[PDB]
Amino acid sequence: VGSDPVILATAGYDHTVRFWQAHSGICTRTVQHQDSQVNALEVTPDRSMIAAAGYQHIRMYDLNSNNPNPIISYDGVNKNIASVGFHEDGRWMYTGGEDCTARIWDLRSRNLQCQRIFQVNAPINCVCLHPNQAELIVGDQSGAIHIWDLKTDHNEQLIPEPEVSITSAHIDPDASYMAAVNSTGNCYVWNLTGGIGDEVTQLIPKTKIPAHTRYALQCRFSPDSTLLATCSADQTCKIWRTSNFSLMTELSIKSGNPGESSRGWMWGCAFSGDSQYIVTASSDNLARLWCVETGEIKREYGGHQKAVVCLAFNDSVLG
Amino acid sequence: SNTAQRLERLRKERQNQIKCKN
């Protein structure tokens, strides 16, 4: 069930997606996702359904009732779906597939046909909606960032560095910056559109922040737009500031022992409405809850039987 | 008669099968 202002779920390789709440770390509902693994899951902004996307299908799971089955399934693509998302009023789906495409879907059982396709020469790894719900970022395995506006049908392509695949990109809800990470850990931050009027979409490279010697897998802002957390394959999650882009906080799950040899990577993270407590998904068969100030963990959920690669954490707007 | 049991099998599983939209 999901009749609560805050919700939390994780997904991975154990063929289940777990829902729980951060009161005592006990699971509420284990929804059965079989025949594939979940790349990414997202909850609907009306807080009625959740969506798990992995390997050629997007499965909806109901939140108000107790149903372990995929009520609505979307198929048609031929490979994986890296990331999905919805309009903030629940009108259209932006889904980035593994093969070559970033497409739109219509959520109503009617012939509206607001669905378009965007085709590039590379397998795409990340999609990100603009906070004004007008533009969209595509990030692929050739290091290219396709700024595609849904009003027109022409798209900008930007290459900071070729020969390296970029993995994630995100824009803070205050619309201040745009950061992105690649497969060597470099995190470039361009200044986004300042042209609120007619969507001119000018970008100037502000900084590149060199960290994360291993692969950097996900970078996300905060809703307060004062912090930015990024997770990397050296079993670390580091939160930086937006003032001078220095290191605010460092978190690690490393045991300090040479007998483990990277027992689990840092796959995903998310902020809260206060930007005070974060929830992190590591591949050590459990998820953690940390604070952005004291450094030490505050909570743990270890009900999974395999690694987990994606997690969803939304709460109420007040915070 | 094998066809009657196969018909029973198909109707019983088809009753549970069709419950979702693709």
UniProtKB/Swiss-Prot annotation, chain A:
Chain residue numbers at which the record places covalent cross-link Glycyl lysine isopeptide (Lys-Gly) (interchain with G-Cter in ubiquitin): 298, 306
Ranges for the WD repeats: 1-30, 33-73, 76-115, 119-158, 161-200, 211-250, 261-302
Entry comment on modification after translation: Phosphorylation at Thr-44 by CDK1 promotes ubiquitination by the SCF(FBXW7) complex, followed by degradation.
Phenotype for residue 185 to D: Abolishes interaction with MTOR
Subcellular location: Lysosome membrane; Cytoplasm
Cross-link (Glycyl lysine isopeptide (Lys-Gly) (interchain with G-Cter in SUMO1)): 306
GO biological process: cellular response to hypoxia; cellular response to nutrient levels; cellular response to osmotic stress; cytoskeleton organization; DNA damage response; negative regulation of apoptotic process; negative regulation of autophagy; positive regulation of actin filament polymerization
One Gene Ontology CC term in the entry: nucleoplasm
Keyword annotations: Acetylation, Cytoplasm, Isopeptide bond, Lysosome, Membrane, Phosphoprotein, Repeat, Ubl conjugation, WD repeat
Tissue: Broadly expressed, with highest levels in skeletal muscle, heart and kidney.
Main localization, broad class: membrane
Entry's Gene Ontology molecular function annotations: protein serine/threonine kinase activator activity; protein-macromolecule adaptor activity
Tagged with keyword tRNA processing: no
Keyword DNA damage: no
Glycyl lysine isopeptide (Lys-Gly) (interchain with G-Cter in SUMO3) crosslink site(s): 79, 208, 238, 254, 298
Protein origin, superkingdom: Eukaryota
Function recorded in the entry: Subunit of both mTORC1 and mTORC2, which regulates cell growth and survival in response to nutrient and hormonal signals. mTORC1 is activated in response to growth factors or amino acids. In response to nutrients, mTORC1 is recruited to the lysosome membrane and promotes protein, lipid and nucleotide synthesis by phosphorylating several substrates, such as ribosomal protein S6 kinase (RPS6KB1 and RPS6KB2) and EIF4EBP1 (4E-BP1).
Subunit structure: Part of the mechanistic target of rapamycin complex 1 (mTORC1) which contains MTOR, MLST8 and RPTOR. mTORC1 associates with AKT1S1/PRAS40, which inhibits its activity. mTORC1 binds to and is inhibited by FKBP12-rapamycin. Within mTORC1, interacts directly with MTOR and RPTOR. Component of the mechanistic target of rapamycin complex 2 (mTORC2), consisting in two heterotretramers composed of MTOR, MLST8, RICTOR and MAPKAP1/SIN1. Contrary to mTORC1, mTORC2 does not bind to and is not sensitive to FKBP12-rapamycin. mTORC1 and mTORC2 associate with DEPTOR, which regulates their activity.
UniProt protein name: Target of rapamycin complex subunit LST8
Gene: MLST8
UniProtKB/Swiss-Prot annotation, chain B:
Tissue: Ubiquitously expressed, with highest levels in heart and skeletal muscle.
Entry-annotated residues carrying Phosphothreonine: 3
PTM comment: Phosphorylated at Thr-3 by AKT1 or RPS6KB1 in the presence of growth factors; the effect of this phosphorylation is however unclear. According to two studies, phosphorylation at Thr-3 by AKT1 is part of a positive feedback loop that increases mTORC2 activation.
Signal sequence annotation: none
Compartment(s) of residence: Cell membrane; Endoplasmic reticulum membrane; Early endosome membrane; Late endosome membrane
Cited function: Component of the mechanistic target of rapamycin complex 2 (mTORC2), which transduces signals from growth factors to pathways involved in proliferation, cytoskeletal organization, lipogenesis and anabolic output. In response to growth factors, mTORC2 phosphorylates and activates AGC protein kinase family members, including AKT (AKT1, AKT2 and AKT3), PKC (PRKCA, PRKCB and PRKCE) and SGK1. In contrast to mTORC1, mTORC2 is nutrient-insensitive.
Quaternary organization: Component of the mechanistic target of rapamycin complex 2 (mTORC2), consisting in two heterotretramers composed of MTOR, MLST8, RICTOR and MAPKAP1/SIN1. The mTORC2 core complex associates with PRR5/PROTOR1 and/or PRR5L/PROTOR2. Contrary to mTORC1, mTORC2 does not bind to and is not sensitive to FKBP12-rapamycin. Interacts with MAP3K2. Interacts with ATF2. Interacts with MAPK8. Interacts with GTP-bound HRAS and KRAS; inhibiting their activity. Interacts with IFNAR2.
Domain notes: The CRIM domain forms a ubiquitin-like fold with a characteristic acidic loop, which recognizes and binds AGC protein kinase family members substrates.
Family that this chain belongs to: Belongs to the SIN1 family.
Protein name: Target of rapamycin complex 2 subunit MAPKAP1
Organism the protein comes from: Homo sapiens
Gene: MAPKAP1
Residues of the full protein shown: 84 to 105 of 522
